[PDB]
Point group: C3
Chain length 157, copies 3
């Protein structure tokens, strides 16, 4: 059996940098407003993984209303989601993540992001892709109001 999933997330800028994306602290004039650590990339990825396993989404598994997850390490959440996916008999095919942001520059950090995500999913780095694109000053990402991220995931068996 092969199964696909798709995730999508958005956080607004606010407060002071740095931002955490893909598990990586990236310097920036602004921070990301969030109940958790604000990791848009890892939230979208988790949604894509949960989606492929028909387990719902981060909001189902870890509510924005529970004080246990305030300030939470989004990597913990990723690892918890992954344990529950594996408990259902799933194994990783591949993941592909798309960070949508006018700034900061993401490319320097992508290698460490992939290190983190490969480790969290107990897979090879070769099964994890991350990329970035701007929207050329258009939309809320273009105007510097926030960052969006998508992910797809392919699961096996």
């Amino acid at each position: 059996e092969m199964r696909i999933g798709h995730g999508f997330d958005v956080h607004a800028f606010g407060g002071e940098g740095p931002i955490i994306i893909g598990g990586v602290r990236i310097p920036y004039e602004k921070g990301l407003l969030a109940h958790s650590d604000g990791d848009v990339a890892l939230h979208a990825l988790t949604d894509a993984l949960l989606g492929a396993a028909a387990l719902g989404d981060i909001g189902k598994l870890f509510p924005d209303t529970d004080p246990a997850f305030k300030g939470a390490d989004s990597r913990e959440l990723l690892r918890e989601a992954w344990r529950r996916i594996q408990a259902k008999g799933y194994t990783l095919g591949n993941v592909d993540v798309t960070i949508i942001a006018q700034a900061p520059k993401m490319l320097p950090h992508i290698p460490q992001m992939r290190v983190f995500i490969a480790e969290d999913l107990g897979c090879h780095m070769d099964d994890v892709n991350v990329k970035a694109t701007t929207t050329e000053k258009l939309g809320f990402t273009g105007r510097g109001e926030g960052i969006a991220c998508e992910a797809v995931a392919l699961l096996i068996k």
Copy 2:
């Protein structure tokens, strides 16, 4: 033997009175959605993903804005009919995953019923259907309460 991927995306603007129909579910809201059909963004994006996997183009290439026969149409009927044409070509369902993007109303209490509706229209197990929701934290047209967007991916098997 063969596996195929599809992607769909759809947007409707709010307008007039509630309720809204999303994933076939009547959801109470102070506003409705503007559409030629019933406005089911979630089912429109799903349909587009299924047709795209089967390389049959899209929902426009089957049910045009022009035709007055599709006015107020049950998007489930469109879904079932696109599904018939996809099956006519040899494909069976792998799985589908749908992402509703909206600031409001809350979608989560309605997701189980949406999945029941979609699993039936596609003749599959409910375990092959996933629906989720996310806000854009007040950002963009969805964040400002102007509309709702939905995305879907589908895997088909031949």
Copy 3:
């Protein structure tokens, strides 16, 4: 038997004179698309989907906006070079599905020609390439006619 999924997304802003180039096709329009290369949002998003599935990064990494060698670049050359690298890694094409998000110009008449170009660029049959277009009902930056967005998913086989 190994299959891999990829996703790409891109946006370009309108500006300067038409025509625009989308999916390889010169499309008459009142404004152009501002880019470093020729501005083909569709092929960029598609290239990213393919590169993503192969875990080769993205177009910005492969073809930096800083390098003058890519000024005015034919996006189809970028697509074919990315594809060559993916194939060197042992991948063959499952299928692709592309969604153009634009208020105008009208994409439908041009889609057959886009599919021919993409099919040629990937050494595949047209059956394995789906392209569709949709609007966001006058919402957001595409709805206001500010630019054009494109998403793509891809399935690769090793």
